[PDB]
Amino acid sequence: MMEGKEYIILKNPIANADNSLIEIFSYRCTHCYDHHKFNTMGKVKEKLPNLTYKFYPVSSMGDYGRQANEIFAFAAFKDGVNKIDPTDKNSLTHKVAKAYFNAYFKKKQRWENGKNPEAFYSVGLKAMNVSKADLENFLKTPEAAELLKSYEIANPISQNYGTPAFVVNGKYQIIPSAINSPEALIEITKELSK
């Protein structure tokens, strides 16, 4: 509960993020994979059901960060329409992250280092069971523009301590040395979110 020990105050806050825990992550981030395997954010949601939980991908990370942002924005949008929390293991967000984490870390896939975005999109499109056209049409919408703009802030936040980064109410990033357990993450989030 002390600035500079458990948390820092972001110089610029995430817009529209009151009463929320947001995980800034990358598909090519190993600890992000760990936190997905043990569904950390889902554990927080269980103990703090009334917060909003989001995942902000980091477009500046990986050869395909910019394409991943599109796919995750589409998953977030659809999870929203479907009223499934993105920390739910049945969400499209979770299914998409699982597929990319699996591909990147277990299969050591790199999709030709940036030269084959079609193969990269396909992992996410298959995971969501939608077509490339669905994605192209989503990307024409204002809802897509808003999600993709909101994700821009994940890039400067990721430079504070790397990924994953945990941001509460859009204003405070939990300092990673303070997160010694999901219990600690929950306690800190509960303190910072009131």
Numbering used by the authors: 1 to 194
What's the paper's own text on this?
The bacterial proteins of the Dsb family catalyze the formation of disulfide bridges between cysteine residues that stabilize protein structures and ensure their proper functioning. The oxidative part of this network consists of two monomeric DsbAs (DsbA1 and DsbA2) related to EcDsbL, which cooperate with one DsbB.
CjDsbA1 crystallized in the C2 and P212121 space group containing two monomers in the ASU for the monoclinic form and one molecule per ASU for the orthorhombic form, while CjDsbA2 crystallized in P3221 with a single chain in the ASU. The entire length of the polypeptide could be traced for CjDsbA2, except for the C-terminal HisTag. The active site of CjDsbA1 was observed in the reduced form, while the CjDsbA2 formed a clear disulfide bond. In contrast, the CjDsbA2 experiment was performed under native conditions (without DTT), as the CjDsbA2 reduced form did not bind to the Ni-charged resin. Additionally, the observed effect may have been caused by the prolonged process of CjDsbA2 crystallization (several months) and spontaneous air oxidation or, alternatively, by a photoreduction in CjDsbA1 during X-ray data collection. Redox potentials for both CjDsbA1 and CjDsbA2 were within the limit characteristic for monomeric DsbA oxidative activity (−60 mV for CjDsbA1 and −116 mV for CjDsbA2). We observed that the CjDsbA2 activity in this test was slightly higher than that of CjDsbA1.
